[PDB]
Amino acid sequence: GVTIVKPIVYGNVARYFGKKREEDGHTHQWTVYVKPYRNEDMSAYVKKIQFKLHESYGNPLRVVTKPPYEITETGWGEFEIIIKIFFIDPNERPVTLYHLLKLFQSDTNAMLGKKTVVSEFYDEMIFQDPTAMMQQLLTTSRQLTLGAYKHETEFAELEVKTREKLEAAKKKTSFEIAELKERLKAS
């Protein structure tokens, strides 16, 4: 009768090189990742997360161990990445996630000239009737970082949300300086 929910967020960010590789054939540097929504260390209950990429790569099955869980790799096309989350408790069934590697922008986002592509989805790992050890591990998770934790799902809108404040404050300071100090010098 014990149910513990661990919210997570998985996805990938991609950056366009601006030109296709000379002889390789890659166009975007992308980083698939799995990270928690709440500021907590997932490794307290996660043993390893495997990322099975396309067979075209030398090693399709990547692995990570610690709270980040990101592999940086370059590619040329979009494909489905199978993410399998293994827990410390071997009696707990691993969780399998399916994420579509997104590298290209939509026409609307392309017209905006934004360089970074982002696609991560909100998810929750439901542990129904977990073992005593797994329950303790889930309940004893510590905080990961001292700062805040954020997500840029789409980014198209988060960039505008950030700019509306950043550029506003920057322009206000620039004006307060230029309009006032020149007249102060005039006096």
Binding site: S174, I177, A178, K181, E182, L184, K185
Partner: peptide, 15 residues
């Protein structure tokens, strides 16, 4: 103050 005023005016022009 003055050189930074010049620099910031040039920046605002470029901006």
């Amino acid at each position: 103050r003055e050189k930074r005023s010049q620099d910031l005016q040039k920046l605002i022009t470029a901006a």
